[PDB]
Paper text:
FucOB displays α-1,2-L-fucosidase activity and showed no activity against α-1,3, α-1,4, and α-1,6 fucosylated oligosaccharides.
A conserved glutamic acid (E541 in FucOB) acts as a general acid catalyst. The structural comparison of FucOB and the FucOBE541A revealed that the protein structure is mostly preserved and that there are no substantial conformational changes (r.m.s.d. of 0.477 Å for 761 residues). The crystal packing analysis of FucOB and FucOBE541A structures reveals a strong π–π stacking interaction between W453 with two prolines residues, P765 and P783, of the neighbor protomer. Consequently, this protomer restricts the entrance of the substrate into the active site, supporting the inability to obtain a complex crystal form.
Author numbering: 25 to 785
Write the structure that this text describes.
Amino acid sequence: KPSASNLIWSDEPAVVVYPQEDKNSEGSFGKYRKPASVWEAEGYPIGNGRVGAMIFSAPGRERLALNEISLWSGGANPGGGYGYGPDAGTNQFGNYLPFGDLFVDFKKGDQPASLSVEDFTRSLDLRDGIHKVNYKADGVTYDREAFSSTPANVLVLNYKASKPGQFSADFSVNSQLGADISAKGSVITWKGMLKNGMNYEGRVLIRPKGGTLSASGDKISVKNADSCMVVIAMETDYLMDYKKDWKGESPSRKLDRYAAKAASADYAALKQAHISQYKSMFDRVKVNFGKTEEDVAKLPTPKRLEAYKKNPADPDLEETMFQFGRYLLLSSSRPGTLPANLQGLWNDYVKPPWACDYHNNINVQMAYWGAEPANLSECHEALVNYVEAMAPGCRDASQANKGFNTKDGKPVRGWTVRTSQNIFGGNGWQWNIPGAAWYALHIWEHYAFTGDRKYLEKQAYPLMKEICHFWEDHLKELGAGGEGFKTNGKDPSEEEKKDLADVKAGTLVAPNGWSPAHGPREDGVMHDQQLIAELFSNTIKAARILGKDAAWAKSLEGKLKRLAGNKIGKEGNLQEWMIDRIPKTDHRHTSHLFAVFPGNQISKLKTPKLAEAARLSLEWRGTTGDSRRSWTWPWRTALWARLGEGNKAHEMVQGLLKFNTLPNMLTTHPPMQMDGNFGIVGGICEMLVQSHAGGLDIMPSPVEAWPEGSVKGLKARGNVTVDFSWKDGKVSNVKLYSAQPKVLPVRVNGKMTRMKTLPLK
């Protein structure tokens, strides 16, 4: 019997096509028409934070769409444009690129093997992070295994058979970038230099047991082998340092230091080291939402999803969805490497949607919503190190914009970002003015969840203060009654001026802001005011914790108190602008709800009137049309949970699975966008534990779809690990762990208590 959770599998062979459309037969496409549709829905991903593959397993052929997180076109992009493509130069924005493909054409003898076999299954086992394939043919049981090893820093494949000498396959390497491919001995090497100057090189090392190996052309033929281990190594010359012009040691020199050593190891030792390392991150969080009926839990993932759309009652599938997001984050974000982009690190497009880049409008943030609460804190370091490394480029583009100039005609202090960012300090497309403030929330929350004072002083606080310096220069002061208020560049009408009657002189507002996705360009947009208030408050807290800059922090506290705050509209909704406009109930964005999540300003415990207004705004929002996005469901899940609506929050988990989830459990915008997989981790975490409103809140509101369950290993602010179970309407077995003894205010079962922490194990 198959596992009811933590296992994504299918009894149907994956559709195997070349990414180049003209290279496939019509039969090879299956039900699809485009090779990008095949890639996003059929592949199973593996990764170790730097190298990964989307796996397409079939009895006759196998495709591994390879990736290295640093393979990027483009460059500094001084013009601030959004041009990309595989030939984008240093003057263009660029995009994440596919490293290549490994095609395995299995053979019986000298003829191709059968395409249909018996009892075929392909599986991605989240319990050990291994892609597994199994089938039978002519009385022989074949088995394949694949994973991305962190300790070995390579991809490891292994093909076995129940009878000796029954493995034969042809290994070839495909490239969409015109790479120079050559096969000599037992290694296929492909390499190239992008138009922007970055060098890359990959190597496929073939290590069979028995049989004969031959390198004919640019392929390698294995015949009548007992088994076969394959090692895939990929490097670029990228270095996350602007001072070195983003160039480090050559990829060939790096591969010469470990690639052959990994291929010389015994496969059982590589797999043992991978499983041990992988479980050290995956097993940190265990969760159980209930039991699914065995008739449903035995279905393969594509059929189980179709069953979910008709009957969305599958707690074990939702646990798989939750853990899959943790799996994907740990497989694409590690300290020392680049952060996860729009698609984690998996991409076969030469020209991807939105350049598969770093979108700071929400996607990159969402990618790391579950990093802290789901106990993957070191994955968050990739984002902070990246924001710090990209900062010199952001200062260049920010200071070059005269629209940011201060009142004295001088360039602005600090920096902010455009909507899109690459890995060379380049910024693309429109300006995202409060974007750097959003990064500062992530910068702070990493300290808030770990208590790492060294991190706060050495890296976090210097970045936060600089981002504060930008807003000290850019903030605009309004007179009494909002004298200088401007909307769309023009003064307020007589009716609009009535909403500004209570505006006190000296009020600070973000000038000429924009509430994401609609509305006029207008001062004091709630979205911007909430982000800046969160930035000033967290920076003042960091200064106090560090005992630093007492005079400046005292001044920033003054400015914080003068920032235009939230208002409740005449209809009871939380206002989105300083102008009490009619609620945009048909809109898919709730940008003025940032203060509820991921911001920490509005809460039912501390601000009950504002929280009721925010709940009204969300209640009047629909879940149809363009609201069915990969990023809408997880944001709305966390919002409903923080407003005390566990049932409404669970309905957004159902919506993500019903309308924006592919048969391989990857979330789709459309097309495939991993922000849904990432963000739903943070959303479900808020349904279980909240630690932002002055203490621990254990399951603040019940979830009728989860009548009985338990969780272990969730993280709370203050570096506290939380374990508990629940049955009926009550929570029991609450255990709090920390490195040092602590007493926390804990709200549980509708009662406010204080609890002591136990020693962490």
